[PDB]
Ligand binder design. Structure first.
Ligand SMILES: Nc1nc2c(ncn2[C@@H]2O[C@H](COP(=O)(O)OP(=O)(O)O)[C@@H](O)[C@H]2O)c(=O)[nH]1
Ligand SMILES: [Mg+2]
Lengths: 178, 192
């Protein structure tokens, strides 16, 4: 069996921990607490291959910028996340996450991931974003961004409805195997 | 500046705090979510130009919180001091609740009063945030996680992770102790 290390990063509260737990445990956490550092393991099957995925959870807050790179050594694939309901977090993808990840993880494949897919047409969400002349990220913006930053690929998912959660981790696994 | 200078309470701090108290306490994930980097950067630049002439209503609330935490992290020496760092850590290493608490408050009277001024204002702020946990979802614990690296700094940074959890416990206990002492003071006011 093949062992690959995945690290997940992105703005605070954009759903990294739910994404990881729903894939590994098929369960959806309810506690509202920010992650500092955690580890999970998920087993995955792609293209007839058997992979043990080490999932490294991190903090999205700038406050942990000095500590976060402790997670980066020997990474085989990156999940770089933003939230569909937050245009600000997409903005921070080329401005903050891409430079940090390309610097500590050069030559490591990056899967750009738009989280919380269930919210793109959710009514309370669009109401709130419209208050600030914003709207949910459109797939196009997400896909475009993945090209700007040179991601291995673009996936959207919703951890809560599990929509796409699976495909995220096969893309990531296939990225890692090469 | 304005920013990254030696620390009643600095007007930039107060201005930022008072606006968030007036406007932000119902925002889900206050201090947990970050602002847009560029909008945050512009707000920081503005508060170097004309600190009082800044209409904060023109900025997003997570940019405003972003700049607040950026201010704390850019202080020459952290709010809680370099000197007392080791003593806060040990206060936390004590075996049971009430003496950890008693030690932490014992460390606090050792602070230079300018640090003590800004720090107590900030802790009061965080109390107000947590009292409204039912709306904004921020527990004392969540706030401690976020603010602990802002308030105290060692450098390894290997087992700085082990240390970060302790300064988190320290700040979490301050928030909680101030919060219950709030509950009791409100009670005592109606008494005798
Ligand atoms: N609607 C929706 N909410 C989500 C999803 N994933 C996470 N959340 C919520 O977003 C908040 C933070 O999620 P979390 O995984 O802890 O964010 P992290 O800080 O990036 O690790 C919590 O309120 C979650 O319940 C999702 O797929 N859809
Ligand atoms: Mg997390």
């Amino acid at each position: 069996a093949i062992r690959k290390k995945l690290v997940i990063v992105g703005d605070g509260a954009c759903g990294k921990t739910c994404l990881l737990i729903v894939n590994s445990k098929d369960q959806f956490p309810e506690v509202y607490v920010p992650t500092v550092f955690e580890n999970y393991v998920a087993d995955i099957e792609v293209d007839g291959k058997q992979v043990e995925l080490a999932l490294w959870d991190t903090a999205g807050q700038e406050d942990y910028d000095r500590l976060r790179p402790l997670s980066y050594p020997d990474t085989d694939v990156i999940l770089m996340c933003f939230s569909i309901d937050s245009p600000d977090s997409l903005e921070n993808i080329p401005e903050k996450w891409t430079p940090e990840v390309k610097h500590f993880c050069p030559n490591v494949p990056i899967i750009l991931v738009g989280n919380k897919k269930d919210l793109r047409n959710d009514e309370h969400t669009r109401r709130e974003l419209a208050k600030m002349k914003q709207e949910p990220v459109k797939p196009e913006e997400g896909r475009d961004m993945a090209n700007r930053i040179g991601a291995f690929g673009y996936m959207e998912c919703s951890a809560k409805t599990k929509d796409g959660v699976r495909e995220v981790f096969e893309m990531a696994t296939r990225a890692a195997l090469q | 500046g304005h920013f990254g200078v030696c620390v009643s309470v600095p007007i930039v701090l107060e201005k930022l705090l008072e606006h968030v108290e007036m406007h932000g306490l119902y925002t889900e994930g206050l201090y947990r979510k970050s602002g847009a980097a560029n909008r945050t950067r512009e707000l920081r630049q503005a508060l170097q130009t004309d600190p009082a002439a800044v209409k904060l209503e023109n900025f997003p609330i997570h940019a405003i919180t972003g700049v607040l935490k950026q201010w704390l992290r850019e202080l020459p020496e952290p709010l809680m001091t370099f000197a007392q760092y080791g003593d806060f850590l040990r206060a936390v290493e004590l075996p049971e609740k009430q003496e950890q608490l008693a030690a932490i408050y014992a460390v606090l009277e050792h602070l230079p009063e300018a640090n003590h001024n800004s720090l107590e204002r900030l802790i009061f702020h965080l109390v107000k945030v947590a009292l409204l946990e039912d709306v904004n979802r921020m527990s004392p614990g969540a706030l401690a996680i976020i603010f602990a690296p802002c308030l105290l700094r060692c450098s390894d940074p290997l087992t700085s992770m082990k240390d970060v959890l302790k300064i988190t416990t320290c700040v979490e206990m301050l928030i909680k102790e101030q919060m219950r002492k709030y509950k009791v003071k409100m009670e005592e006011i109606s008494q005798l």
